[PDB]
Ligand binder design. Structure first.
Ligand SMILES: O=c1[nH]cnc2c([C@@H]3N[C@H](CO)[C@@H](O)[C@H]3O)c[nH]c12
Ligand SMILES: O=c1[nH]cnc2c([C@@H]3N[C@H](CO)[C@@H](O)[C@H]3O)c[nH]c12
Ligand SMILES: [Ca+2]
Ligand SMILES: [Ca+2]
Lengths: 316, 316
């Protein structure tokens, strides 16, 4: 079993991912670390604790992270995407399970130091906790096995505005710290995940399936689906976070390109992710020079990824 | 005959374009306006005057433009792409023809005001003179028939650094003024022009042809081709400026997408061009909201464009 920490802002697609992850036999979830984005950090913690209970694992530690980005200020949340409670307005009763005392940043540092080169991190929201752990401990990047990030828009439009994807826009400084940390990083941009969908028919197939969490997953996805229709004009949902989980277990369902990634932190392009492919010899040095390259998902085998996601969601 | 002003920084591909333009029948070149970029403004004026003489038209007015970008400061020139003299180190004797007294900005306003909705502008370098014209006369944008711009990198890597294309990076503030002016604008990015090449074999075919300027064009192209081999790893040249001239006469050899274009003026992404395609309904307003969209070249019919360029370059 491969040790995994999920850094997340649940979140409708985050919740689908977490529930899938608990059903994956090759994976050992050693903890959930929470962040803002789809909902405030407190709302993310509440949902993560509820997901642990729903999965029959209330013993799995939940470590609350940062309430704001590194630059500060109360963050704007995607409630128009994920609902007021972050899970499509189900307004569920409060969990009995409680979060651990330590912060998400401290939990990440402790578990990575406890098991060097063994713990993988799946980043599903803004990268604040991951950046805090990199800054607080300089050996973190050498001790973490792999960091799989759902974030960015590589040579494609963003989803917050034309320039930026939501997770990166949520904390641009944190994303730039993570992408230049020298750790073994895999980034999956929305240029990849918007190709991997569940249509209205696929969602109905989920409702009618014998899946353990089928009824709950369908109720959540109703609000998520309606946003895609109003904004993207698509009758269904984009599987952003489940696709990044698929890259953890089955990287062979994708192709990757190596290259230095930088994040714009100011101006009209705040949150924009840009990769230097290294196929052109520049005349002079630039902000992409001297850093260690990372892996950027380039193509996706959509039927294989959809088959893997559907089998986990529809498992009894 | 359609009236045309060429705003240019000659420049090797600029020189190919200017010489093609003088041979093109459905066009009347009413003037050349010069700018920095490939070489300093004074060097661009010298080359433009030499091109008018070589074409047998020393009477065609040459109006010298801005020596530095809108924000000020001595500009960095692409002498590693176009040579010390701006024309591949041919070190030709000085022209006998002299430039006009008025600035490029004043010439642009005067000729567009003289013939409202008749004069087209082909922009081959940084957009400083065009922006100065828009700022000095706020009706300029509405009076120019069309502005065809060679510039930007749309959902592709830049050629200065991963973020920016050279002409836009030369004056980001000027490009942003032009793209938001409300004028009838057609932008041709390097995402289009890098698909339209002359290989080493094609250049040899040009040398062996009966073309009026074949010998001169080939000598000048030697330094230009060499940069492509050292930097891009391509044995030949990218026809950037001749392709934008092809978009003036034959826009039917391309497909275009309508959308608001903004330019980043600060940070690591200074000079980055980004278009909002308008295919997604945004939840809130952004820097792309409220402006008039422009036409962005999306695809190119490479054989048709190559055929048109080759027939002009190889005409006796
Ligand atoms: O349209 C959207 N706007 C903002 N955030 C999201 C999300 C969330 N943010 C990430 C994708 O931007 C992903 O992790 C998901 O949990 C999905 N769709 C949208
Ligand atoms: O590789 C390059 N770096 C900088 N400028 C140029 C140019 C010039 N600048 C424009 C394309 O960036 C184009 O108008 C041309 O005259 C060609 N190739 C390069
Ligand atoms: Ca998420
Ligand atoms: Ca030029």
């Amino acid at each position: 079993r491969d040790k995994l920490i999920i850094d997340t802002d649940p979140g409708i697609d985050d919740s689908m991912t977490i529930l899938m992850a608990f059903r994956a036999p090759s994976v050992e979830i050693i903890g959930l670390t929470t962040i803002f984005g789809n909902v405030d950090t407190k709302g993310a913690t509440r949902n993560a604790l509820l997901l642990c209970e729903r999965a029959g694992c209330p013993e799995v530690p939940v470590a609350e992270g940062s309430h704001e980005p590194l630059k500060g200020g109360k963050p704007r949340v995607a409630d128009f995407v994920h609902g007021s409670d972050g899970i499509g307005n189900l307004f569920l009763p409060a969990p009995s399970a409680k979060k651990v005392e330590e912060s998400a940043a401290d939990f990440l540092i402790n578990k990575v130091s406890e098991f060097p080169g063994e713990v993988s991190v799946l980043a599903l929201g803004p990268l604040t906790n991951v950046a805090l752990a990199i800054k607080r401990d300089p050996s973190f990047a050498s001790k973490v096995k792999k960091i799989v990030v759902l974030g960015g828009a590589f040579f494609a439009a963003g989803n917050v505005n034309p320039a930026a994807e939501a997770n990166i826009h949520g904390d641009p400084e944190a994303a730039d710290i993570v992408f230049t940390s020298g750790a073994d990083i895999v980034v999956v941009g929305i240029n990849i995940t918007t190709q991997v969908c569940l249509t209205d028919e696929d969602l109905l197939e989920l409702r009618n399936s014998k899946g353990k969490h089928a009824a709950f997953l369908y109720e959540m996805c109703k609000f998520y689906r309606d946003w895609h229709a109003k904004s993207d004009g698509f009758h269904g949902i984009f599987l952003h976070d489940p696709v990044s989980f698929t890259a953890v277990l089955h990287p062979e369902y994708f192709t990757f390109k190596k290259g230095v990634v930088r994040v714009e932190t100011q101006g009209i392009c705040t949150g924009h992710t840009l990769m230097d492919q290294g196929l052109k010899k520049w005349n002079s040095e630039n902000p992409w020079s001297g850093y260690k390259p990372i892996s950027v998902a380039w193509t996706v085998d959509v039927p294989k990824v959809i088959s893997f996601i559907k089998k986990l969601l529809m498992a009894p």
